[PDB]
């Protein structure tokens, strides 16, 4: 997260870290046994870490649970990044104040809606600096029109832009798969962008409201 602020220990209880020997992606807990993240975060040997604040030191509120199953959306396209969504089943259910699930959306959010984006990703636009603690960012959902103007022929119906045209505030490497929560509902999954915090290049997110049916049914039959 570039241009954000320290969230505060366990103030984003649905935030998880995907660990493969180190933090490589984020994710959201939507069920005591299920996590949603990005399809490009697919990796074998994933360990999910819940109740985390400082990802570098054990603080006692953590629960490390390995994934028993990783289901990438059947129509994920690695070239176009369309349908960049994945469900991870925990080997055992998490014990749900510091660890809680986030609600799926009843409907899609509109341009202008303010959302909270969180993660342990790079905090520099020019450079590298990974935080120990979780970072937060409030960014508004942008219109489909401007999103498409920022990325000609790259935005699908399953993606939305959020951020600032001026630059300086954005998601970045290490944030992928993390939540974009608006009005208490999970509306997006951090996905991609041209660099980080660049002017006229807002971050692109997976539009969760379009997958609610697939998620609910997929969770129930696995």
């Amino acid at each position: 997260i570039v241009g954000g602020y320290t969230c505060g220990a366990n103030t984003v209880p649905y935030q998880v870290s995907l660990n493969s020997g180190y933090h490589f992606c984020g994710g959201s807990l939507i069920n005591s046994q299920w996590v949603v993240s990005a399809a490009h975060c697919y990796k074998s040997g994933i360990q999910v870490r819940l109740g985390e604040d400082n990802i570098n030191v054990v603080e006692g509120n953590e629960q490390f649970i390995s994934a028993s199953k990783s289901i990438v959306h059947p129509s994920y396209n690695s070239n176009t990044l369309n349908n960049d969504i994945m469900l991870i089943k925990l080997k055992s259910a998490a014990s749900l104040s510091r660890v809680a699930s986030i609600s799926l959306p009843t409907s899609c959010a509109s341009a202008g809606t303010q959302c909270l984006i969180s993660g342990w990703g790079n905090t520099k636009s020019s450079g590298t600096s990974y935080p120990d603690v979780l970072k937060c960012l409030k960014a508004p959902i942008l219109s489909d029109s401007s999103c498409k103007s920022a990325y000609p022929g790259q935005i699908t119906s399953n993606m939305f832009c959020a951020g600032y045209l001026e630059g300086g505030k954005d998601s970045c490497q290490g944030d992928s798969g993390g939540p974009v929560v608006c009005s208490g509902k999970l509306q997006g999954i951090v996905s991609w962008g041209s660099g980080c915090a660049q002017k006229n290049k807002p971050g692109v997110y997976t539009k969760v409201c379009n997958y609610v049916s697939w998620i609910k049914q997929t969770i129930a039959s696995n």
Binding site: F24, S78, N79, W192
Partner: protein
């Protein structure tokens, strides 16, 4: 020769550690891969990297 190409992080926002052959240094080094649109000088291990690009 893709072994002489600089490392490509790509547009995706993951922090995945991969290897690339650095012809200047004459060795495979690590770099952060974003998770999508990898070019060919991107390996999962130093061994794969040396086997494919070593001495390029």
């Amino acid at each position: 020769d893709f072994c002489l190409e600089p490392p490509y992080t790509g547009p995706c926002d993951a922090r995945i550690i991969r290897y690339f052959y650095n012809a200047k240094a004459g060795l495979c080094q690590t770099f952060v891969y974003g998770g999508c649109r990898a070019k060919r000088n991107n390996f999962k291990s130093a061994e794969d990297c040396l086997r494919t690009c070593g001495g390029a």
